């Protein structure tokens, strides 16, 4: 019928993608953490921090096949496309039968007395059978367990001190042991590494491998600034950011400015043009011309 | 201002930004988090229009 109808919306599409990642070329020592001949005990797990490096995760597939490789807050396949605020590797050796206990939401003596994960957990649980390294005919010394705890641990807490628990009889603080090559797989040690990944909208240097491109201004483009992904038009900013700040937001907490990781200039983000499309029709029974 | 401000809410999701959900998660988990955000945003629009 004659009149104006709103039928669709229009957008201006981006023409290219911009990848701007930190200058750092140092490789993250994931190989050294995973590839070792000596591991920390369970009650005294080794927390090693990864920072100021390129988080290339393909080396873990070159290192070994795994018993389990499960991430909770991220997909493994896409790990190379993220930047992390805080990455920690917690290394310990546990039995196969209790590997399922190293996960958010689990209950058990190993999860509660030595290594408790948070329930709001983002990160990866990596397990790989170490039988070829730890097996001994005389018996290993890799198993170190705290059978009894006076008070259960909170997430990522550790308690090194040993005390005898009294029922009022004596419960010894440490159950330590080895195993032989003839033990069943469920009783063999597995090296377990928990990669705790704190992600807070691209605040930090550690990023997976990316091929940086040139910065293009005054065009509708896609962008990725240290993992912060979006679409918009980048322009030179006249905002006076302190050395401290990296990002800006408007009155409604929408990101409207970023710091370039390589030039440290401030860029404003203007959304790409969009709007409604209305069609002015004289009416089918008069004319098929429209505006 | 309220309708725009509601976009920053998580509504139980891991993040309020759809691009981050799609950037880190595989389709299945992304679909769950997105359904949580769709429900919240749709409720915000229905309230605004009413």
């Amino acid at each position: 019928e004659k009149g104006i109808y709103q039928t669709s919306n229009f957008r201006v599409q981006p023409t290219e993608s911009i990848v701007r990642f930190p200058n750092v070329t140092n490789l993250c020592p994931f190989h050294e953490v995973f590839n070792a001949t000596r591991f920390a005990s369970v009650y005294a797990w080794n927390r090693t921090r990864i920072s100021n490096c390129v988080a290339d995760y393909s080396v873990l597939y070159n290192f070994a096949p795994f018993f389990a490789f499960k991430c909770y807050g991220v997909s493994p396949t896409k790990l190379n496309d993220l930047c992390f605020t805080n990455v920690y590797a917690d290394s310990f050796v546990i039995k196969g039968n209790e590997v399922s206990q190293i996960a958010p939401g689990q209950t058990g003596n190993i999860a509660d007395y030595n290594y408790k994960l948070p329930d709001d957990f983002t990160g990866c649980v990596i397990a790989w059978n170490s039988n070829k390294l730890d097996s001994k005919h005389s018996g290993n010394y890799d198993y170190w367990y705290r059978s009894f705890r006076k008070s259960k641990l909170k997430p990522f807490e550790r308690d090194i001190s040993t005390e005898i628990y009294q029922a009022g009889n004596c419960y010894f603080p440490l159950e330590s042991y080895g195993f032989r090559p003839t033990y069943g797989v469920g009783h063999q040690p597995y090296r377990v590494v928990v990669l705790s990944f704190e992600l807070l909208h691209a605040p930090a240097t550690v990023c997976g491998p990316k091929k940086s491109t040139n910065l293009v201004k005054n065009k509708c483009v896609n962008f990725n600034f240290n993992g912060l992904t979006g679409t918009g038009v980048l322009t030179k900013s006249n905002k006076k950011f302190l050395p401290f700040q990296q990002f800006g937001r408007d009155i409604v907490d929408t990101t409207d400015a970023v710091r370039d990781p390589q030039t440290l200039e401030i860029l404003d983000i203007t959304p790409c043009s969009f709007g409604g499309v209305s069609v002015i029709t004289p009416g089918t029974n008069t004319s098929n011309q429209v505006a | 201002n309220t309708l725009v401000k509601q976009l920053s809410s998580k509504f139980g999701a891991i993040s309020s930004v759809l691009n981050d959900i799609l950037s880190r998660l595989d389709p299945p988990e992304a679909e769950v988090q997105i359904d949580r955000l769709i429900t919240g945003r749709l409720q915000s629009l229905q309230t605004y229009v009413t």
């Binding site: 009155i251 929408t254 | 309708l3």
Partner: peptide, 29 residues
């Protein structure tokens, strides 16, 4: 004598109460 050809009272009314939607430009127009 003035653009918009409004009366003095209309100008007062327009000045007391306070095109491109730079703000809230998130699909809301």
């Amino acid at each position: 004598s003035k653009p918009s050809k409004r009366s003095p009272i209309e100008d007062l009314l327009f000045n007391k109460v306070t095109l491109i939607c730079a703000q809230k430009f998130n699909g809301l127009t």
